[PDB]
Amino acid sequence: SHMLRLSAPGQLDDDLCLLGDVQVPVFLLRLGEASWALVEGGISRDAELVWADLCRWVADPSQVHYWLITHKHYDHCGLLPYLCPRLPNVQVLASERTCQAWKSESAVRVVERLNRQLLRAEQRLPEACAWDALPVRAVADGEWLELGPRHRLQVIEAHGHSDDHVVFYDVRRRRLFCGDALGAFDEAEGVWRPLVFDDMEAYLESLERLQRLPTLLQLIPGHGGLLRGRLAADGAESAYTECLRLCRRLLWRQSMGESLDELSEELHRAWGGQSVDFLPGELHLGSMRRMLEILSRQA
Ligand SMILES: O=[N+]([O-])c1ccc(OP(=O)(O)Oc2ccc([N+](=O)[O-])cc2)cc1
Numbered sequence: 001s002h003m004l005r006l007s008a009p010g011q012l013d014d015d016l017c018l019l020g021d022v023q024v025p026v027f028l029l030r031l032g033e034a035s036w037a038l039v040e041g042g043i044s045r046d047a048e049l050v051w052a053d054l055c056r057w058v059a060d061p062s063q064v065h066y067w068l069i070t071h072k073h074y075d076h077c078g079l080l081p082y083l084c085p086r087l088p089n090v091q092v093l094a095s096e097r098t099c100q101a102w103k104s105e106s107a108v109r110v111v112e113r114l115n116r117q118l119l120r121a122e123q124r125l126p127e128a129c130a131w132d133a134l135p136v137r138a139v140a141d142g143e144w145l146e147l148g149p150r151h152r153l154q155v156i157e158a159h160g161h162s163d164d165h166v167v168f169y170d171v172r173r174r175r176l177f178c179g180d181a182l183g184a185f186d187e188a189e190g191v192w193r194p195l196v197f198d199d200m201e202a203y204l205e206s207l208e209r210l211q212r213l214p215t216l217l218q219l220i221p222g223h224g225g226l227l228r229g230r231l232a233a234d235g236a237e238s239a240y241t242e243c244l245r246l247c248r249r250l251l252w253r254q255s256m257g258e259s260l261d262e263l264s265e266e267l268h269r270a271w272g273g274q275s276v277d278f279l280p281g282e283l284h285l286g287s288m289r290r291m292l293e294i295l296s297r298q299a
């Protein structure tokens with residue numbers, strides 16, 4: 001592995017642990033002697049694994065007070081109905097738009113169906129909270145989240161990947177929980193893979209703004225672990241660069257009369273192997289196609 005990327009379960013920093021699979025992690029923040037927060041909501045089929053890992057660090061789960069959610073995609077909120085009932089004092093903090101999603105029938109349907117596709121043959125999910133019954137408090141762009149005496153995180157709107165996406169910045173630690181707004185970090189090549197699934201102009205504007213944060217020490221996307229050193233410092237800028245590079249590649253190939261699919265299959269082939277364990281294959285290729293449709297339209 002690489003010194004600049006922490007990608008093992010367990011303790012990452014004095015106050016921060018990784019629960020579950022590094023590909024779809026849940027982060028555990030220790031806010032004080034008797035108080036904790038989770039960040040990112042995972043996939044439903046990992047409920048027992050994440051529960052098990054949580055109970056190793058947290059003797060009393062009633063001390064889990066907050067659960068921060070970056071966006072409504074099925075792989076970032078799948079655990080909520082299954083673990084919220086075991087966390088009697090938890091408050092889920094999400095954007096207004098993300099909250100809206102959990103109150104839409106069609107939306108919840110998609111999230112459940114994509115989560116069910118990842119179930120292994122054996123397993124049963126535990127009893128679930130109704131999605132519209134989750135203990136949520138909507139948070140606003142620019143809001144300060146006073147989680148504990150040494151944990152204060154600012155909510156920053158970061159749409160583009162999705163129309164509801166937010167990130168959470170801990171300026172004390174120069175630590176940014178970025179969700180999928182920078183794309184997917186390619187563990188093999190050390191570069192960002194763009195994930196433009198809603199709006200290219202918003203996605204790029206969000207990265208412009210994140211580049212203006214004070215220099216990052218820790219950059220924690222939605223998949224793959226914790227990035228540090230130059231990868232954190234240069235992250236938002238690099239993510240922007242990689243988006244433009246994809247745009248131009250698309251423009252090249254289309255100018256050679258290629259159809260949206262040549263590049264899609266090329267991307268699905270070049271990148272699909274990293275997510276195969278949490279993205280159904282038809283979804284990865286289809287996500288590629290959608291992103292290329294978006295870039296094409298807006299360019
Ligand atoms: O069907 N959706 O609305 C949807 C699409 C992609 C998606 O996964 P996301 O985590 O946004 O996309 C990724 C795509 C590829 C990789 N990868 O190259 O390792 C990671 C995340 C989640 C939900």
Ligand SMILES: [Fe+3]
Pocket residue numbers: 071073161162180
């Ligand atoms: Fe996503």
Ligand SMILES: [Fe+3]
Pocket residue numbers: 073075076180222223
């Ligand atoms: Fe994701």
